[PDB]
Amino acid sequence: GPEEITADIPNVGEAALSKLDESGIVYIGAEVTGGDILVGKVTPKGETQLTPEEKLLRAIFGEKASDVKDSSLRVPNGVSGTVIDVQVFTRDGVEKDKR
Amino acid sequence: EFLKPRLVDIEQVSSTHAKVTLEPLERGFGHTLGNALRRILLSSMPGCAVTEVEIDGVLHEYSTKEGVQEDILEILLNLKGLAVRVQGKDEVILTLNKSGIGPVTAADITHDGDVEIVKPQHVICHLTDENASISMRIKVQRGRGYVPASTRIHSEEDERPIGRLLVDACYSPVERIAYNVEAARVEQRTDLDKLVIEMETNGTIDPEEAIRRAATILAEQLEAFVDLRDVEFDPILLRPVDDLELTVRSANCLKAEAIHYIGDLVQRTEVELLKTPNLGKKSLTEIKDVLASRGLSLGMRLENWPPA
Amino acid sequence: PGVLKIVKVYLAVKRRIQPGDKMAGRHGNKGVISKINPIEDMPYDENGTP
């Protein structure tokens, strides 16, 4: 399927979501260091056999039940400093990003 | 039998330049006192400097504001040279707002209660159109030495909102200081020495007060010489033994072996406690099972064991 | 065709001078810094400029 990007990333605490907007990329001017998450990108996974364990997982948790993976770009080691710009570009036809 | 220096004939050349004279001095003490005072004054002098700022529309230091003639990075550099004098407080906030055409200087900073701007012609930005405005909030602090913005971390205990600009702090009002040694004018004494200390600050400190501060710092440092003389940490450990919900049979066995603490049990490797009477192969598994639940496997090695 | 949407992020880091950093003139003389001495230890002329 498609690799949509959004702020809502499963299995990541509210501490790492402090510096992301409604689209899923860091605010301009946020001072970053270490390995903080920069872009929230999800990669779909394949599953078509809804076993009862997966059924109860989807019942107690969200509809996806964290099936999707999280291929989110992180700050590489030894790199610090405030962000400057974000350069989102969109393919024609698809709904444009909020920013 | 040593003459005491008296701070006399202090004269001021300009708003920054200053000359302090120490009339009575002995043979070799002039250079000693001059060097000590110069090093003390250049190293550690209290002063006020801008710590962080907040401009209305900016997000970081690497941006620009429409209508101003300088980058935000440049504006921080012109602000770093701003010198203020605060009385009775240490976290004074200096808010300035200006609109129109022409340079914006420190003279238009809002008149706070007790804050004296040494020079009011210190330009910090320029405006270039009639309808643009600049609104910033400057925070000044009091310190002792050079404190870079990057080094400090305690200021990040409470999260800084995006928009708070961090600027380095110098805190040292003394920029240049030199001393000179001449012969005193006293003729009744055979030969006497006088010392004059040319001091150039940014106008934030009084030269006499600066000399007094250096002298008291030196005296307090020397106070330590006038009387020489002188001639199991983890919370999971150190817990009561009867907290692992063991069986009745293990309770008496541990008491006989005198395992009264959790950490004593974890230090026993599997080949040696089996020799204990009536330990039980299945019961031994129970002790291993409950200790594996806490993540404490048998066979660890400690170094120091306090009684408590 | 395989790419649906792209995002790029830029960082800005200020590198203050420090002992290991290399400094050179424009006459073939170079070198690495060895120590950032305080102001009060640098040699000073008669007027006191270090």
What one-character-per-residue DSSP string does B159-224 give? Answer: PPPTTPEE--B----EEEEEEEEEE-S-SSSSS-EEEEEEEEE-SSS-HHHHHHHHHHHHHHHHTT
B134 DSSP β-pair partners:
B98
Identify the bridge partners of residue B49 per DSSP, sorted by sequence position.
B141
Q: Any CB–CB contact under 8 A between A12 and chain C?
A: no
CA C41 to chain centre: 21
Q: Do B42 and C40 touch (CB under 8 A)?
A: yes
Contact A29 B159 (CB under 8 A): no
User: Chains that contact A by 3+ CB pairs under 8 Å?
Assistant: B, C
The single residue listed with the structure tokens 């129109």 is B100
Q: Using alpha carbons, select from B266, B261, B288, B42 the residue that is nearest to residue B170.
A: B42
Which of B98, B158, B151 lies closest to B124, judged by CA? B98
Q: Which residues contact B240 (CB under 8 A, 6 or more apart)?
A: B260, B261, B262
- B162 and A30 within 8 Å at the Cβ level: the answer is yes
DSSP, collapsed to helix, strand or coil, labels residue B286 as: helix
Cβ–Cβ of A29/B63 closer than 8 Å?
A: yes
Say yes or no for a CB contact (<8 Å) between B60 and A82.
yes
Distance from CA of B239 to the nearest CA of A (A): 32
Which token pair is B271? 């080949």
Look up residue B145 and give its DSSP letter: S
- At a CB cut-off of 8 Å and minimum separation 6, what does B299 contact? B266, B269, B270
Which residue carries 């008669």 as its tokens?
C46
Q: Do C40 and B198 touch (CB under 8 A)?
A: no
The Cα B52–Cα A32 span in angstroms is 18
**B39 near C40, Cβ under 8 Å?**
yes
Backbone interruptions in chain C following residues (C to N > 2.5 Å): none
Query: Each residue of A31-47: b (16+ CB within 10 Å) or e?
Result: bbeeebbbbbbbeeeee
Q: C33: distance to nearest CA of chain B, Å?
A: 19
Q: Where are the alpha helices (DSSP H) in A40-86?
A: 52-60
Q: A–B: how many Cβ contacts below 8 A?
A: 20
- CA B285-B290-B292 angle, to 5 degrees, is 90
Interface of A with B (CB under 8 A): 18-19, 27-31, 82-84
Instruction: Using an 8 Å CB-CB cutoff, list chain C residues near A90.
Output: 5
**Chain C neighbors of A73, CB-CB under 8 A:** 9
Specify the 3-state DSSP secondary structure of B33: helix
d(CA B289, CA A69): 35
Q: How many other CB atoms are there within 10 angstroms of residue B292's CB atom? A: 12
Find the farthest-apart pair of alpha carbons in chain B and give their distance in angstroms, rounded.
104
Strand partners, B126: B103
How many Cβ atoms from other residues are within 10 Å of residue B137's Cβ? 15
Element (H, E) at B192: none
Contact B68, B81 (CB under 8 A): no
Signed CA dihedral, A88, A90, A94, A98: sign only: positive
The sheet with strand A81-86 has its strands ordered as A31-32, A81-86, C9-12
Q: How far apart are CA B122 and CA A47, in angstroms?
A: 68
Tell me the C-alpha distance between B168 and B146, whole Å. 8
Q: How far apart are CA B186 and CA B141, in angstroms?
A: 46
- CA A88, distance to chain mean position in Å, is 15
Substitution target in C9, C39, C42 with the highest count of B β-carbons within 10 Å is C39
- How far apart, in whole angstroms, are the C-alpha atoms of residue B122 and residue B39? 29
B178, C12: Cβ pair inside 8 Å?
A: no
Q: Kind and range of the H or E element at B246?
A: none
Resolution (A): 3.8
Contact B62, B69 (CB under 8 A): no
Q: Using CB atoms, which residue from B42, B178, B198 is nearest to C39?
A: B42
Distance CA B300, CA A44 (A): 43
Question: From CA C49, how far away is CA A85, in angstroms rounded?
Answer: 43
Q: Does A56 touch chain C (CB under 8 A)?
A: no
Structure tokens at B273: 């406690």
Cross-chain residue pair B198–C46, CB shorter than 8 Å: no
Which residue is closest to A37 within chain C, CA to CA?
C9
Q: Which residues, including other chains, have CB under 8 Å from residue B232's CB and lie 6 or more apart?
A: B238, B263, B302, B304, B305, B306
Beta strands C9-12 and A81-86 are antiparallel
Q: Do residues B215 and B33 lie in contact, with contact meaning Cβ atoms separated by under 8 Å?
A: no
User: Which chain B residues are closer than 8 Å to C14 by Cβ?
Assistant: 150
Q: With contact defined as beta carbons under 8 Å apart, do A12 and A70 qualify? A: yes
Hey, are the CB atoms on C9 and A73 less than 8 Å from each other?
yes
Are B227 and B219 within 8 A, CB to CB? no
Cα–Cα dist B130/A9, whole Å: 47
Contacts of B285 (CB under 8 A, 6+ apart): none
| Distances from the Cα of A98 to the Cα of A25, A83, A88, angstroms | 11, 19, 10
Task: Measure the CA angle with vertex B34, ends B208 and B220; round to 5°.
Answer: 70
Q: Are B68 and B98 in contact (CB under 8 A)?
A: no
| Angle at which helices B248-257 and B281-293 cross, to 10° | 90
Which amino acid makes up residue B211?
A: I
